[PDB]
């Protein structure tokens, strides 16, 4: 195979976000070699005297253009001196699977072709995630460095005539002009290593008994036409024995059928209506790249992803992985509710509040202080790997149900009566007013500096809510010293209740007021019923503050979750 | 899992020969003790200290009792301290494949569950073959230890509770009672290691333009319902590109479709009929083990097994394996035609004539003195593994077609034109009277050893045959030193023609007589003729000197090849 140094011209907009670089597919196809440069800056962070004995795991969620970008990573990494590429069969390879492979075969980093929860039709979105040696997301330093190379790039080394059959399992060698050691491409099965990893984490026999034994827990699983389909089929059906009727929407389609892979009460309507039938005890849908999960109960019941980590923590020892390693620490993103906190507060385990993104959880994990973490964006995980994991979280819920023997509804009613209830809703104001929320979200910072307000008696609706705290958010990583940026306000008090007033930082075209609300109830009666209605006191104080409707301008709902 | 010991009673008939233990299915089935007993002695030949750090490859052919016999192997090997078992997917692993996997990963040996060539049903046949560290079939020194132990087995260690899921890929780990290190079961892909091996031997790229480009060679390969089916679909149909409709009967059926998977024009009648119509350019029939093959050309042109090895040898530097590592030696069995001699003699490289039996090819391949070996019983192999390979032979044939850009007919036609034709045929006498055939060989032997016979002139038309050499074949193996006596009665004639008699019934039940006739013709007008017409005078001479009709009561042979 030939090697040719193709001169190119840099791009401005090639910068990664909270997780990887994502753009509209047109920006990939119409732009004269956009992916070739972003790929070349990635391999450039790996020093020349280190590439010949290095292995890059390249994966993918099956999305449109995945096939062409994989061909580019092979031809570009080949001409740049990378010794081996471990691609999954057909390119299909989950984000928790890529995190898992990297840690297993000691790979110096990994590239994932996925825009996650972003839609994927031929007119939708496509993206490039870059995981580092430790297995998880490259933290800001490495990503912005990729950005810093994307601006001053002048050329890129490529082997234009290197065509590889990604469908066939096996090792293949390629010899390129003057380089003693041959370029190797090792195509691995997609599910294998990942299933062998989950095998030593849960009791696969105790689960086998729960899904196809003495009564059969009727589960309904929606893979949402994304990469986790083959996994539910080979793992939950073919291995653990769940009936084929359980695995719905499990064939990876480029278009994802049309729907958006983000699993939630709006973007995932199909499964909730069929869960309202009452014949299913448990139900679960997944993200596009399979690292997010949504838990549902009998009759369409819903477990908030902020509550889901709280239950898989009070019952954490139902999972063998934790009986052998121990619970070194709990964590949650600042926007996720305070339910995990109530469980962490009742035991000798430390708790950590991190910025939204899986990239900074890893630092707590590597330094041995975090074991269970997750966020409101349907993303529960643990330190078994360094990425989020949708199927680990589903199988963590089946381990709890099988040991406890109760329904999903009763586990949480008991959990709410045992600690109290933390209400939550992601009720946003997506792209809305061009001049209102400027001064409004700069009005509270200063105004509260008066010594007479620490003690407010009430006369609205019912039940007194005593005063205590109130402030803002920033983050200093305890392991390497990284810092964060101002962005989201949060009004708190005695027990624990809050509105994360989110001003956008990267919002150029407009500001999304992505709202995260939290209400902590103590009593038996006011906890078990109503969702965005028992939240009223929090959205009473939060709606009265700035005279918002006549001082900013927005009273029409947008996208509730 | 609990390890328990069962006191057992031994069996005097459990004796492993060249191809392991071949008994009928209804002797392992309900005879409480038979399968467990034999496996126990197999893993007893490996020292108690050499077991924890050791692996054994296990596989079968996909028919009756194979799956049941693999659950038995894991339960006994585990209680006996074997570290790792590498089992193919579903238990399906072809014989050439097991030799490849044992030598690749360097296992201590391997257990092959295949019945050689007899059918595999409820009342049919079932066998246990044990290969050793170099990937070859165990020899006398080791089969006797196995038999000496199996007839004195008092106690046997088993894990009754060990349940292995054979269909799911990946490493399953089992912890046993009272043991600090765990037992490992690793399920491997059936084709993979074996395909990656062929990928280095042949040129898969030159074979892609050959089977699926514009100038496309239409083939037709019948897997005969045996284990070689999965390998033909993945290598020939998936990776090389041949249309899926070319690989026919490629699904290992539980019964094999009633008939024996053996390369014989009648056994492979479907293949012969579909190739007579005119359309197909290359055809092939197989066996339920993966060790033999029946090559056919346009319109039904038959390629003789003996000529096959002389065509591959004269065009051997076409297969990259040979261009890169050289040809250390050629070898054929004694009954095989002298067609390989005309090639090895002109292209001056050491030729080795050995007794019927792969075991003799292996020795020369372990002492690095043998590269390509051929055998009249539909076989052709090399030092790529340490067993016979039916698909390697097909792959070496397609390689020669792509390189020479001629039809099967013309490559044999112009070979006969440049080296001459060794008309060959093999008459078999099936159920013969055990003593009347033995006294037939002895009087023939006394007829050969007196001073006068080494110059006798025989005739049946125009050509006279002058006896040059006459001997009962003795082999002194240059590796084991061991001498193999008897072996066969050779009447070598002065013109290169030979008549060979072998009695294969000298150990149990009724005897079979195999009469091999080989005749050399060098003028181009006579090489175009029919073999049974051409060999007619030499056959009258064979039945005359033998007085076969007289001693066996047989006026015609059972099978003519
Ligand atoms: O603030 P953002 O950009 O919307 O971030 C959201 O999606 C990110 C990537 O998601 V996946 O789409 O990588 O599962 C997640 O890691 C964050 O937890 C989630 O809040
Ligand atoms: Co995701």
Three-state SS at B516: strand
Ligand 1 nearest atom to the CA of residue A291, by list position: 14
Round to whole Å and give the CA distance between B242 and B213. Answer: 10
Find which of A167, A190, A196, A320 to mutate to test the B interface (most B CBs within 10 Å of its CB): A196
Pairing of strands A497-502, B21-24: unpaired
- Edge-to-edge strand ranges of the sheet holding A282-286: A247-248, A219-222, A282-286, A293-297
Round to whole Å and give the CA distance between B137 and B215. Answer: 42
> Class of A198-300 per CATH?
alpha beta
Radius of gyration of chain B, Cα coordinates, nearest whole angstrom: 24
Burial (CB count <10 Å: 0-12, 13-18, 19+), residue B433: middle
Round to whole Å and give the CA distance between B164 and B68. Answer: 11
Three-state SS at A100: helix
Q: Which residue of B has its CA nearest to A195?
A: B170
Which residues contact residue B85 at a Cβ distance below 8 angstroms, ignoring those fewer than 6 apart? Answer: B55, B56, B57, B58, B73, B74, B77, B184, B185, B186
User: Do residues B222 and B285 lie in contact, with contact meaning Cβ atoms separated by under 8 Å?
Assistant: yes
**B196 contacts on A by Cβ (under 8 Å):** 170-172
Nominal resolution (angstroms): 2.7
A388 vs A62, A141, A372, A381, CA distance in Å? 18, 20, 11, 5
Residue nearest to atom 6 of ligand 1 (CA): A377
Ligand 1 nearest atom to the CA of residue A18, by list position: 3
H or E element, residue B35? helix B34-42
Same fold, A1-197 and A401-553: no
Q: Please tell me if residue B191 touches chain A, with a CB cutoff of 8 Å.
A: yes
| Alpha helix stretches (DSSP H) within B295-383 | 305-314, 320-325, 339-346, 358-366
Residue nearest to atom 17 of ligand 1 (CA): A357
Pairing of strands A282-286, A219-222: parallel
Round to whole Å and give the CA distance between B514 and B401. Answer: 33
User: Do residues B254 and B62 lie in contact, with contact meaning Cβ atoms separated by under 8 Å?
Assistant: yes
Round to whole Å and give the CA distance between B99 and B106. Answer: 10
Q: Supply the DSSP symbol for B233.
A: I
Give yes or no for residue A377 CB within 6 A of ligand 1. yes
Round to whole Å and give the CA distance between A498 and B50. Answer: 65
Contact B189 A200 (CB under 8 A): no
Round to whole Å and give the CA distance between B65 and B113. Answer: 9
Residues within 8 A of A (CB atoms), B 286-305 only: none
Shortest alpha-carbon distance between residue B163 and chain A (Å) = 10
Q: Say if residue B382 carries a ligand binding annotation.
A: no
Pairing of strands B330-333, B294-297: unpaired
Total Cβ atoms within 10 A of residue B62:
27
Identify the sign of the CA torsion A107, A113, A119, A120. negative
Round to whole Å and give the CA distance between A407 and A301. Answer: 11
* B1-197 is classed CATH 3.40.120.10: yes
Which residues contact residue B499 at a Cβ distance below 8 angstroms, ignoring those fewer than 6 apart? Answer: B490, B491, B493, B515, B516, B517, B518, B538, B541, B542, B545
Give yes or no for residue A260 CB within 6 A of ligand 1. no
Round to whole Å and give the CA distance between A421 and A406. Answer: 19
Give yes or no for residue A61 CB within 6 A of ligand 1. no
Give which of A412, A410, A336 is closest to A372, Cα–Cα: A336
Give yes or no for residue A487 CB within 6 A of ligand 1. no
- Specify the CATH architecture of the domain A301-400: 3-Layer(aba) Sandwich (3.40)
Q: Ligand 1 mean position to A68 CA, how many Å?
A: 25
Give yes or no for residue A125 CB within 6 A of ligand 1. no
Shortest alpha-carbon distance between residue B311 and chain A (Å) = 29
DSSP string, A127-175: EEEEE-TTSSB--HHHHHHHHHHHHS--EEEE-TT----TTS-EEEEE-
Round to whole Å and give the CA distance between A300 and A472. Answer: 36
| Alpha helix stretches (DSSP H) within B373-466 | 390-404, 408-419, 434-448
Give which of B446, B499, B442, B445 is closest to B468, Cα–Cα: B499
Give which of B480, B497, B498 is closest to B489, Cα–Cα: B498
Provide the total of helices (H) and of strands (E) in chain A, helices listed first. 19, 21
Burial string for A187-197 (b: 16+ CB within 10 Å, else e) reads bbbbbbbbbbb
- Residue tagged active-site, from A41, A94, A116, A246: A116
Total Cβ atoms within 10 A of residue B53:
10
Partners of residue A248 on adjacent β-strands: A222
Total Cβ atoms within 10 A of residue B165:
15
Find which of A167, A168, A197 to mutate to test the B interface (most B CBs within 10 Å of its CB): A168
Measure CA of the first residue to CA of the last residue in chain A; give whole Å: 52
Partners of residue B142 on adjacent β-strands: none
Find which of B105, B172, B187, B196 to mutate to test the A interface (most A CBs within 10 Å of its CB): B196
**B199 contacts on A by Cβ (under 8 Å):** 170-172
Give which of A158, A143, A146, A9 is closest to A73, Cα–Cα: A158
In chain A, domain spans: 1-197, 198-300, 301-400, 401-553
Contact B239 A168 (CB under 8 A): yes
User: Do residues B184 and B176 lie in contact, with contact meaning Cβ atoms separated by under 8 Å?
Assistant: no
Round to whole Å and give the CA distance between B469 and B212. Answer: 51
A286 vs A260, A294, A296, CA distance in Å? 11, 6, 12
Task: Let me know the angle formed at the C-alpha of A362 by A361 and A363, rounded to the nearest 5 degrees.
Answer: 95
Q: Please tell me if residue B167 touches chain A, with a CB cutoff of 8 Å.
A: yes
CATH code for residues A401-553: 3.30.310.50
Q: Please tell me if residue A324 touches chain B, with a CB cutoff of 8 Å.
A: no
Ligand 1 nearest atom to the CA of residue A117, by list position: 12
Contact B199 A170 (CB under 8 A): yes
Kindly state the tokens that stand for A72: 């580019």
A490 vs A342, A360, B13, CA distance in Å? 19, 21, 84
């Amino acid at each position: 195979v030939k090697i040719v140094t193709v001169k190119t011209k840099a791009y401005p907009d090639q910068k990664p976000g909270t997780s990887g670089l994502r753009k509209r597919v047109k920006v990939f196809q119409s732009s004269t070699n956009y992916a070739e440069n972003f790929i070349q800056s990635i391999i450039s962070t790996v020093e020349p005297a280190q590439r010949q004995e290095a292995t890059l795991v390249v994966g993918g969620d099956g999305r449109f253009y995945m096939k062409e970008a994989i061909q580019l990573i092979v031809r570009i990494a080949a001409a740049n001196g990378i010794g081996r590429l471990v691609i999954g069969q057909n390119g299909i390879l989950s984000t928790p699977a890529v995190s898992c492979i990297i840690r297993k075969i000691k790979a110096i980093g990994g590239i994932i072709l996925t825009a996650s929860h972003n839609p994927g039709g031929p007119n939708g979105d496509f993206g490039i995630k870059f995981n580092i040696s430790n297995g998880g997301p490259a933290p800001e330093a490495i990503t912005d460095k990729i950005f810093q190379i994307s601006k001053t790039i002048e050329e890129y080394a490529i082997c234009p005539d290197l065509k590889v059959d990604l469908g066939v399992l096996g090792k293949q060698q390629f010899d390129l002009e003057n380089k003693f050691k041959p370029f190797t491409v090792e195509i691995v099965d997609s599910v294998e290593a990942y299933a062998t990893m989950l095998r030593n984490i849960f009791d696969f026999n105790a689960l086998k008994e729960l899904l196809s034994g003495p009564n059969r827990l009727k589960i309904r699983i929606d893979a949402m036409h994304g990469v986790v389909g083959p996994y539910v089929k080979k793992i939950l059906c073919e291995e653990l024995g769940a009936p084929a009727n359980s695995a719905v929407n499990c064939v990876p389609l480029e278009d994802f059928g049309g729907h958006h892979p983000d699993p939630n009460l709006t973007y995932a309507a199909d499964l909730v209506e069929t869960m309202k039938s009452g014949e299913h005890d448990f139900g679960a849908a997944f993200d596009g790249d399979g690292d997010r999960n949504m838990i549902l109960g009998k009759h369409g019941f819903f477990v908030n992803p902020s509550d889901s980590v709280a239950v898989i923590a009070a019952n954490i020892f139902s999972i063998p992985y934790f009986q052998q390693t121990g619970v070194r620490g709990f964590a949650r993103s600042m926007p996720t509710s305070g339910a995990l906190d109530r469980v962490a507060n009742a035991t000798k385990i430390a708790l950590y509040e991190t910025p939204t993104g899986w990239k900074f959880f890893g630092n707590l994990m590597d330094a041995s202080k975090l074991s269970l973490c997750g966020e409101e964006s349907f993303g529960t995980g643990s330190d078994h790997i360094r990425e989020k994991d949708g199927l680990w979280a589903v199988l963590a819920w089946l381990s709890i149900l099988a040991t406890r023997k109760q329904s999903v509804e009763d586990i949480l009613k008991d959990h709410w009566h045992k600690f109290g209830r933390n209400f939550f809703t992601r009720y946003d104001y997506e792209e809305v007013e061009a001049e209102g929320a400027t001064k409004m979200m700069k009005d509270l910072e200063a105004l509260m500096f008066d010594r007479s307000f620490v003690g407010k008696q009430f006369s609205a609706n019912d039940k007194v809510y005593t005063v205590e705290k109130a402030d803002n958010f920033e983050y200093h990583d305890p392991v390497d010293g990284s810092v964060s940026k101002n962005q989201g306000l949060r009004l708190i008090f005695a027990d624990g209740s809050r509105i994360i007033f989110r001003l956008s930082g990267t919002g150029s075209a407009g500001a999304t007021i992505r709202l995260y609300i939290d209400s902590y109830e103590k009593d038996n009666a006011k906890i078990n019923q109503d969702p965005q209605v028992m939240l009223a006191p929090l959205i009473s104080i939060a709606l009265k503050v700035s005279q918002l409707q006549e001082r900013t301008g927005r009273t029409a709902p947008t996208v509730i979750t």
